[PDB]
Design a binder for these strands. Structure first.
Ligand SMILES: Nc1ncnc2c1ncn2[C@@H]1O[C@H](COP(=O)(O)OP(=O)(O)OP(O)(O)=S)[C@@H](O)[C@H]1O
Ligand SMILES: Nc1ncnc2c1ncn2[C@@H]1O[C@H](COP(=O)(O)OP(=O)(O)OP(O)(O)=S)[C@@H](O)[C@H]1O
Ligand SMILES: Nc1ncnc2c1ncn2[C@@H]1O[C@H](COP(=O)(O)OP(=O)(O)OP(O)(O)=S)[C@@H](O)[C@H]1O
Ligand SMILES: [Mg+2]
Ligand SMILES: [Mg+2]
Ligand SMILES: [Mg+2]
Lengths: 386, 258, 325, 319, 261, 261
DNA sequence: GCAGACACTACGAGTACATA
DNA sequence: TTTTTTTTATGTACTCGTAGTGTCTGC
């Protein structure tokens, strides 16, 4: 069935030794799932960001013979292997994977009865049946009442006897904010380029296509360390007309270039800090900053971060002219928002995307600014409401 | 070429209403012996084993063994329009993507032909559930449905305890405690209401109410139901139909015993 | 028979031969109708140029009176045109055939710039899929409010402003049909104050004929309230030729005597400063100051102070122009 | 019978009749001849041939099973959160017997109109049933499609069609329709097309129906010259603080009947990609937004656009 | 002076509940022969032709011919609070806007005079062809409503065929197909439940289920409905009211294209 | 000391629902004759009087002329927790700042006490003139509620006319006029259905609809209703609630249009 | 003949967003 | 290597929860 399936499914890992994630996260998830071995399998013996995880793996158990963090929340950018890690780690620890993803109904009653089905009963095969590990994929799109249902099931003192592992893409969702305080938080770093280059070499040599490690490194750079996007791009670009991959096919924007939603701190860093030493022209930096600030989204938070961070830099303008024209640009955005929300004319909403890039023309430095998250406007509004 | 002429649509209606909210798919296995359906939930909570032999149909033609993976709701949509007492021709080809059902449901010579598209369901294999049950009792189906509804009125789960005496049902809630004690009811004229006990080694388990109600929704399918339960083996209810086959429901107990 | 109608509705070009200006576009649409090759049309232009009249004349030419209600679906901004309407009545009208007689149907979407972009995105495959069965005509004034995917699917005709040379015979037809005594200066004033818009030409003609009984230059400029060219020339000469107080007194007396408004004075002075051979630094300052004054008149501001600022904008540049030499 | 217009009559039915984007179309030809095509999202300008390429690929892959092995959904359909859960997933689960290397194809045309939740529900039904069904999405704005869907598909990007690529298809249509022409008329059709094959075919059909001959005068009598190439000269004049020629271009655009909103939109679109100083570009964009607020308020005259031009000329001579 | 008198209020309630989600506005054409109403739907796909005879009313007078265009949601709200056993008087003057509906309460004590304001729609008259149809089928209305409701669960567009055998309904949907074929059901004790075939040439045409389900709401008006079908003229649903008049529904077929293959 | 007992709990459970959205507070005046409530609405249009005599209570203790002021946003939630056929006791001390309502739980096993803070409001009695009305009529209560509800779908304001023929309700809107009349209903078995006239001078006044619907929210308290009108006196709606007392509603008319010449 | 239960659509309500 | 919240005023669109209500089953 070589001509029947995708290369992302033909080269999917079927064992723990074939995973492409960070080894620390794999070991932490496996140790967290083996902390359930006493309650689930009835056996005493199973066979910085790192420091908190290693402490919570060695923190012990509650007197109900369970981990005190009963939910493992998995976070990261798309295409890293989070679903693959959850399924491989669950099938490796003797469990049976029960999936509940975003393609289901996700109403607070259907979510409730599906969790009660998945976790509150034993196997219908009797003895020898594998336990159920409830994998909840795409929890960041669930409503807040579904998260409340999940937490009420998690905090019944009706006792939860089976592990639950949740997978999300953005950990800072407003529906998961109570979950992060209660979950074994595993954040996925981007995959190592050398490991992905070696894996793409293995895939291309299995498919009989020749490629240098340089063009595969360029493809990994293009797709922002996405395994699935790189393998799909190789599957399209190889075909069977030609054998050897060319560097200009990867360098071209026709195949393999997808839109990446930028983080807020990455956008503030690329606005305030110049790139380190082509790309040295000011026009390319102008267009790059404009497109990154447009592709991030959440425009009001970007404006608040610019307003709260631009006076904390090592500003070279001692005459305060750059600060004055930046405040003029901020007042320009505010007037545009007011006029668009007053006259119902939202074609005025194409100019405030040029507010961040103006800051990039004003306060771009070669230093390393410590960008903080904006809180002053929201704290002031809450205090004014009080 | 597969043809099965079910003599009455009542049994098909009661089966597809019994497992309407129970299983998400129907996997009909077609052989020369009859039609088999061994389906399991995705969370491994309930199991359905339905067998309809070839003698229970008006006709039965089966050239090759077939696997009909079909949607539950798409067939409930069909037999919401079927007839209670009418002949139902369930037919399919050897290598086809469709499954046809021909009937004359309103008794008004209204020739209805309803087709379905198959589901491509992965071939999971469940060979034989082991049957070495210590406690085998017999009960009427209607009284079981009534007591399951009475438990559903109060609680959310049933504590079921077998005994040489009979089967005790318990349920607890904030409103109150619902409890009955089954007695020997063999001194009646009806043979369906007689409770026959062939048990040893009494077992007390806890089961979900919703799956028990879905199992006992098949009360008019058979007059008498058989209960088979033991320690660490899931509970079986069994409806023996009169001439077509039999139906087995398997329910896994709760982890929190008592 | 006679009816109580406005002259922009009493005199509507029911046929394509009664429209005056866009002769190449109308010839192409007439050859579309005659060859039975009518495409999805996109009629865009300034108001009062005859786009709705064009599509109504085409609909009356294509279909008879006994079948007109089954072939034409006309929707405008007074009707609900949400995405439920595109997926509902419009899609069912497109996907079904006719009732009485065979033929292709016509969906007219007047004022299509007022549609939401969800409805415009739902319109795309309705237009593309049922091209043989039904035809679509979008009419707009702003082409930027229609998505480029809908602009690709329709052949677009720009109904530009009506030139005053071709505007005269239709006005002469309306004058002869209403028994109106008009002079040549009255017709010149009509085609000047209309500015490529037959609606306001007919409205000003009807208003002047009701107010005065005759249509001359004095009656048109009195009924409209517009200042004459000699008044604007006098205002510019006073602003450029003498001091602040005398020019202020003369302009104030002219505005009080004739009842002029500052918006029309600003418009005509703006038209005049591009004709007067000013230096480029003077012209930029004059345009910026006059745009500021025109923006200040849009709210509750005293018109006397804005008139003084209009005088001030030229009293600043007088010395600069003379010292430039 | 009613004859279709040349956009719909001369829609390509084979993938080798599609001009432009030669490498991507050639790889789609290889995939249609062989099979086992990955999930695909085609993005690009309107009128490039994305829907044509997707439909031709689906037809060439499926053959006679196109009626039962293809699910085509548009923006004219519902395709909300309840349709991705119930209809798309049931089609992905549906048994369809196909030859080797061929899968079911769920064409989701114009995928920008789908909401975020429907695209979130699309992810797991894309990933699970990939050995029996495939996805072919077409879009204009690729940022409207979320990043999990773009990771789950091969993102093909179509570029705007060049002059020779449209000229080859125009020569094919002209030789089919026996249309007399000159070279200047075909150049005018290319000029009014602006990289769009739909507009090229529409303008050719309009000129041939109205006049019967394709020279520059017959094209420009019914079609129109493009806006931003003329706006760019006015912006270049405003950069050099030449107010007279900028007002000449502005008054020429005003007497053509263009509204102030279309003119200021073209001015902003030119000033986004203009070649000048970045701080001067930001000053220009801020002045354009300040004028556009007045346009949206209700004051939209020729004096206001002239004041905008005068302020843009002031921004040059104000260091 | 126009003054009609519906003998009972149930027939007007059934008519205005059949047309409520279909007809935009009611154009009552008034003559000495009766009351005519030819109105298209909002989508310009369906057509409703209602004809009420003068002999069906209690008292019917009409001096000069009228054409009253009135709103339908207002008339629906008027007829919602109307009885099924009471007389309803429709009044209209020569040059007024008040169309008066005069009836009694369900308490049967107080009068109720509800005026409506007439509209000015001046719509052109649509010509009914009144030609012969290649298929005429008499069938019960309840069975037609039941089969349309059963076909609405499978698909959205229904291919209805008719031949020498009988009428056949097909709904190729997403679950699958539903093919229901009924013929020669005249061998019952009832007279309404019968399927009769009158004309010859078989026709297959596809229609929307929404308009058919809207047409089936006139089931309490007539026990037996008539279906007229041909290859060019549209689908006609003819309800023959017992002693008042008749109701014709015209539905246009959908555009279907075969595969190129 | 104020200490009162009710004979039926449904009196409060029918009289506080009309005052839920009508008046913002309930001010009770305590005297030896009974409890008197006079409350004017926030828009100064409606005036509610409620006089419940001391002979109707199960027991009644009143030593000093006191006035209590309670809110509605808490009493409406408290009343829904109470039963229907139980007994309600109202208690208020001489110097305390709270009002206690003691009743039985709907489970009929425990006694429920609810306390409400006494709002110290500074009001003055407006003073009804109690003059001779130019029109007095008697109507059924539920029929008047159905009449006021049927005019809600037509216009935002109603017109009440009262000649010697009877009482005419009119509702002129954009849809059309809705006119109903009641006259000479003495030939019925029920005594509460007697629509009678009592005065001579006809009166025609336009009133609001929302306030009349709020007035007809208190219909099952009494059997009949009384309507009093004059040329300039506001409309008086009188309910005779059983034996303990009566309730009066005052509704001001609207400003008439300039129809002179 | 009349009470209990089933699914049906209409309607209330919360939320997001609107550009290139 | 750094995260909590409701304002902008309409119009539209989507999604979900709730409530009359027509009709079927049963004793
Ligand atoms: N070691 C590996 N070698 C090759 N392919 C792999 C490997 N690990 C994972 N993959 C594939 O790469 C993809 C990983 O993405 P998934 O784990 O399925 O989803 P995800 O990582 O959670 O990202 P999102 O947010 O769901 S898009 C899948 O298509 C896997 O089959
Ligand atoms: N070209 C024309 N020839 C003759 N009369 C015209 C012409 N254009 C406009 N008119 C007159 O103006 C009236 C209104 O013109 P319309 O056809 O409504 O123009 P329009 O382009 O639709 O304007 P908008 O954009 O809808 S406000 C017509 O009824 C005629 O009386
Ligand atoms: N590359 C091309 N080669 C030949 N004809 C083309 C090409 N692109 C477009 N056309 C013609 O233009 C018509 C429209 O093409 P489509 O593929 O529907 O446009 P599109 O690429 O989908 O753009 P949008 O975003 O959907 S408006 C086709 O029917 C062809 O007649
Ligand atoms: Mg995943
Ligand atoms: Mg118009
Ligand atoms: Mg397309």
């Amino acid at each position: 069935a070589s001509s029947h399936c995708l290369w992302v499914d033909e080269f999917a890992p079927r064992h723990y030794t074939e995973l492409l994630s960070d080894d620390f996260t794999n070991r932490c998830l496996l140790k967290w799932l083996k902390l359930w071995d006493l309650v689930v399998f009835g056996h005493e013996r199973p066979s910085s960001h790192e420091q908190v995880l290693e402490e919570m793996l060695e923190a012990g158990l509650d007197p109900s013979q369970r981990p005190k963090q009963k939910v493992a929340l998995l976070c990261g950018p798309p295409g890293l292997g989070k679903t693959t890690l959850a399924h491989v780690i669950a099938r490796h620890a003797g469990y049976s994977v029960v999936e509940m993803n975003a393609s289901d109904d996700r109403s607070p009653e259907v979510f409730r009865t599906r969790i009660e089905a998945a976790t509150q009963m034993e196997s219908v095969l009797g003895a020898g049946g594998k336990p159920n590990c409830l994998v909840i994929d795409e929890i960041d799109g669930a409503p807040v009442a579904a998260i409340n249902v999940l937490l009420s099931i998690l905090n019944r003192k009706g006792l939860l006897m089976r592990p639950i592992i949740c997978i999300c893409n953005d950990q800072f969702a407003p529906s998961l904010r109570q979950l992060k305080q209660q979950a074994f938080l595993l954040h996925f770093p981007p995959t190592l380029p050398s490991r992905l280059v070696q894996r793409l070499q293995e895939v291309s040599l299995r498919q009989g296509m020749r490629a240098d490690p340089g063009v595969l490194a360029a493809l990994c750079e293009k797709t922002d360390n996405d395994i699935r996007a790189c393998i799909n791009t190789l599957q399209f670009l190889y075909s069977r007309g030609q054998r050897e991959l060319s560097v200009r096919d990867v360098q071209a924007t026709r195949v393999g270039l997808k839109d990446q939603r930028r983080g807020l701190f990455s956008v503030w860093q690329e606005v305030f800090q110049l790139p380190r030493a082509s790309l040295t022209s000011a026009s390319q930096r102008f267009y790059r900053v404009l497109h990154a600030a447009a592709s991030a989204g959440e425009h009001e938070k970007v404006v608040q971060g610019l307003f709260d961070n631009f006076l904390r830099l090592r500003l070279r303008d001692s005459s305060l002219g750059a600060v004055c024209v930046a405040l003029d640009w901020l007042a320009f955005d505010d007037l545009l928002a007011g006029a668009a929300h007053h006259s119902q004319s939202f074609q005025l909403l194409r100019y405030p995307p040029f507010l961040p890039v103006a800051f990039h023309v004003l306060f771009a430095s070669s230093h390393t600014p410590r960008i903080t998250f904006p809180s002053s406007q929201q704290e002031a509004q809450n205090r004014m409401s009080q | 070429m597969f043809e099965a002429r079910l003599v009455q649509g009542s049994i098909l209606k009661k089966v597809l209403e019994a497992l309407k909210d129970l299983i998400n798919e129907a996997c009909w296995d077609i052989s020369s012996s009859g039609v088999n359906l061994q389906s399991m939930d995705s969370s491994h909570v309930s199991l359905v084993q339905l067998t309809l032999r070839s003698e229970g149909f008006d006709t039965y033609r089966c050239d090759r063994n077939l696997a009909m993976g079909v949607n539950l709701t798409s067939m409930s949509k069909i037999l919401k329009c079927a007839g209670n007492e009418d002949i139902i021709t369930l037919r399919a080809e050897d290598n086809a993507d469709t499954l046809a059902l021909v009937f004359e449901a309103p008794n008004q010579e209204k020739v209805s032909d309803y087709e379905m598209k198959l589901m491509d369901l992965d071939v999971e294999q469940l060979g034989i559930p082991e049957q070495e049950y210590s406690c085998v009792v017999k009960m009427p189906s209607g009284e079981f449905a009534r007591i399951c509804r009475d438990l559903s009125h109060i609680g959310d789960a049933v504590v079921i305890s077998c005994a040489k005496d009979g089967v005790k049902f318990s349920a607890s809630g904030e409103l109150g405690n619902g409890n009955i004690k089954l007695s020997q009811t063999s001194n009646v004229d009806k043979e369906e209401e007689a409770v026959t006990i062939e048990m040893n080694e009494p077992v007390q388990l806890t089961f979900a109410l919703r799956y028990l109600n879905f199992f006992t929704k098949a009360t008019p399918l058979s007059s008498t139901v058989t209960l088979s339960m033991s320690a660490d083996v899931p509970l079986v209810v069994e409806y023996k139909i009169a001439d077509m086959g039999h139906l087995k429901y398997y329910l896994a107990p709760k982890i929190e015993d008592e | 028979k006679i009816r109580n109608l406005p002259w922009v509705e009493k005199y509507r070009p029911q046929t394509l031969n009664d429209l005056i200006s866009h002769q190449d576009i109308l010839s192409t649409i007439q050859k579309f109708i005659n060859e039975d090759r009518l495409p999805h049309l996109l009629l865009y232009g300034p108001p009062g140029t005859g786009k709705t009249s064009t599509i109504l004349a085409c609909a009356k030419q294509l279909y008879k009176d006994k079948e007109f209600g089954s072939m034409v679906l006309e929707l405008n901004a007074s009707d609900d045109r949400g995405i439920d309407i595109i997926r509902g009545p419009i899609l069912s009208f497109a996907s079904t055939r006719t009732i009485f007689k065979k033929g292709f149907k016509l969906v007219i979407l007047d004022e299509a710039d007022a549609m939401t972009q969800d409805a415009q995105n739902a319109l795309r495959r309705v237009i593309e899929k049922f091209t043989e069965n039904t035809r679509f005509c979008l009419i707009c004034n702003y082409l930027s409010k229609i998505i480029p995917a809908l602009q690709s699917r329709c052949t677009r005709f720009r109904f530009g402003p009506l030139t005053p040379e071709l505007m005269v015979p239709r006005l002469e037809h309306v004058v002869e049909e209403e028994k109106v005594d008009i002079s040549e200066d009255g017709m010149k004033a009509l085609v000047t104050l209309s500015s490529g818009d037959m609606r306001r030409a007919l409205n000003i003609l009807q208003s002047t004929n009701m107010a005065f009984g005759k249509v001359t230059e004095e009656t048109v400029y009195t009924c409209t309230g517009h200042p004459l060219k000699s008044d604007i020339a006098n205002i510019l000469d006073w602003m450029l030729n003498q001091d602040f107080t005398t020019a202020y007194r003369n302009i104030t007396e002219l505005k009080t005597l004739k009842g002029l408004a500052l918006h029309d004075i600003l418009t005509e002075i703006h038209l005049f400063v591009h004709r007067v051979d000013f230096p480029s630094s003077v012209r930029i300052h004059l345009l910026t100051k006059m745009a500021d004054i025109e923006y200040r008149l849009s709210v509750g501001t005293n018109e006397k102070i804005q008139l003084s600022s209009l005088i001030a904008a030229f009293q600043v540049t007088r010395d600069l122009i003379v010292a430039e030499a | 019978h009613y004859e279709l217009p040349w956009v719909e009559k001369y829609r390509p039915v084979k993938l080798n009749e599609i001009v432009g984007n030669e490498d991507t179309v050639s790889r789609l030809e290889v995939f249609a001849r062989e099979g086992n095509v990955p999930n695909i999202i085609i993005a690009g300008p309107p009128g490039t041939g994305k829907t044509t390429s997707i439909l031709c690929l689906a037809r060439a892959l499926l053959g006679p099973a196109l009626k039962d092995a293809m699910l085509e959904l548009n923006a004219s359909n519902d395709r909300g959160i309840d349709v991705v859960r119930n209809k798309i997933k049931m089609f992905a689960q549906q048994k369809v017997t196909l030859p080797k290397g061929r899968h079911k194809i769920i064409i989701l045309d114009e995928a920008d109109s789908m909401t975020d939740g429907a695209q979130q529900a699309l992810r797991r039904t894309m990933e699970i049933y990939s050995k029996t069904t495939r996805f072919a999405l077409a879009c204009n704005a690729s940022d409207k499609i979320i990043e999990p869907i773009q990771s789950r598909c091969a993102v093909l990007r179509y570029t705007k069609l060049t002059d020779a690529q449209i000229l080859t298809r125009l020569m094919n249509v002209i030789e089919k329709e026996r249309v007399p022409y000159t070279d200047d008329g075909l150049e005018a059709i290319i000029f009014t097309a602006q990289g769009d094959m739909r507009q090229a075919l529409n303008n050719l059909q309009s000129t041939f129906s109205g006049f019967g001959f394709i020279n520059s005068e017959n094209v420009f009598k019914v079609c129109d010259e493009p806006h931003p190439l003329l706006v760019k000269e006015m912006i270049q004049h405003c950069v050099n603080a030449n107010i007279d020629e900028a007002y000449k271009i502005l008054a020429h655009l005003w007497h053509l009947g263009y509204s102030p909103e279309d003119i200021i939109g073209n001015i902003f679109r030119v000033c986004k990609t203009f070649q000048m100083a970045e701080y001067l570009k930001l000053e220009f964009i801020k002045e354009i937004g300040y004028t556009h607020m007045k346009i949206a308020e209700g004051v939209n005259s020729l004096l206001q656009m002239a004041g905008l031009l005068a302020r843009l000329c002031q921004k040059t001579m104000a260091p």
